[PDB]
């Protein structure tokens, strides 16, 4: 066994998933001056799914280091130390959609929604998005510089081709990039 | 009597805080990606004598509830104190910033930014008029590599704190500066 990964979707809670016998997860976090708190076994083995551990808002704090260990009947199978702020990785944007901005080419405007769990409205989170699109038959994607907003025009799309768009988000200056949204297929109007 | 919109000011404070956090975060990633393998990182973390930051003597909130429960003045004060705590110690990463693939990284640029935001937050407090209010900044009590990675590690954390706390006061103080 080995840690598959630990992540915090909205900087308020996190969970860890892993790939002998029954594997247990122990954790401790530096509370106060020193790591004085004894190891406590995973508080929730169901919530974040099979082979995971979910730490609700009650066990989640930021800027404080944590250490987790996967244990088996043979001893420690894996260890990992981090502070929640390093593991932020937001969920995908939702409600993706487009609309003509305004005949071989066409300009469109794509818009989505921020992941519902991200407190953007109150300041606890600031995301930036990265949009990608391509013709449905090609294999590479055209990236687009990151944006602070939830609408973005895509210019000069050829009307005679169908496109795909997926947007992904990340907490500014923190963490890595999260999952991509479900793709948005775009078939433009063609004037014969 | 009405009041002048705080947006321009918040806007400028917030650009600096993100510039500072951005430098802290990249600078740190770089160094860590060259001299610190996860093994040392863990032993660094499990040993407070090396990982516990000087700035940590300033009582700051640690989760969302805690933070959004503090007034704007306290959050501004906490941020002021963290910024002051770094004015002197940034003179220490001179070399790290030196050999870094800069992109703006230098003890001087970073220091001028601190001086800049420091004043900007003092202005914001006068516009928005306890231990925290009686407490002064944290003095830095001080191998080379473990001293630097520690300075960097603490620089990133505090900069995340400042950008966060200021963002919160901002969403509260400025008409939909976070919404729609």
Curated annotation (Swiss-Prot), chain A:
Q: Identify the domain of life.
A: Eukaryota
- Residue intervals on the Extracellular side: 1-192
Q: Which residues are glycosylated?
A: 56, 97, 102, 137
Record annotation: effect of changing residue 108 to T: In LARS; almost completely abolishes GH-binding at cell surface: 53% binding to membrane fractions
Residues forming coiled coils: none
Q: Which residues form the Fibronectin type-III domain?
A: 92-191
Q: Where is this motif: WSXWS motif?
A: 177-181
Compartment(s) where it occurs, according to its Swiss-Prot or TrEMBL record: Secreted
Disulfide connectivity for this sequence is 6-16, 42-53, 67-81
Substituting residue 116 to C results in: In LARS and GHIP
Q: What is the effect of changing residue 90 to Q?
A: In LARS; disrupts GH binding
| Functional note | The soluble form (GHBP) acts as a reservoir of growth hormone in plasma and may be a modulator/inhibitor of GH signaling.
Q: What is this protein called?
A: Growth hormone-binding protein
- Parent-protein residues present: 51 to 255 of 638
Swiss-Prot record, chain B:
Keyword match Lyase: no
Mostly located where?
Answer: secreted
A single GO cellular-component term on record: extracellular space
GO biological process, alphabetically ordered: animal organ development; bone maturation; cell surface receptor signaling pathway via JAK-STAT; cell surface receptor signaling pathway via STAT; cytokine-mediated signaling pathway; growth hormone receptor signaling pathway; growth hormone receptor signaling pathway via JAK-STAT; positive regulation of D-glucose transmembrane transport
Please, what other remarks does the record include? Answer: Circulating GH shows a great heterogeneity due to alternative splicing, differential post-translational modifications of monomeric forms, oligomerization, optional binding to 2 different GH-binding proteins, and potentially proteolytic processing.
The disorder on record is:
Growth hormone deficiency, isolated, 1A: An autosomal recessive, severe deficiency of growth hormone leading to dwarfism. Patients often develop antibodies to administered growth hormone. Growth hormone deficiency, isolated, 1B: An autosomal recessive deficiency of growth hormone leading to short stature. Patients have low but detectable levels of growth hormone, significantly retarded bone age, and a positive response and immunologic tolerance to growth hormone therapy.
Protein's UniProt name: Somatotropin
Biological classification of the source: Eukaryota, Metazoa, Chordata, Craniata, Vertebrata
Name of the gene: GH1
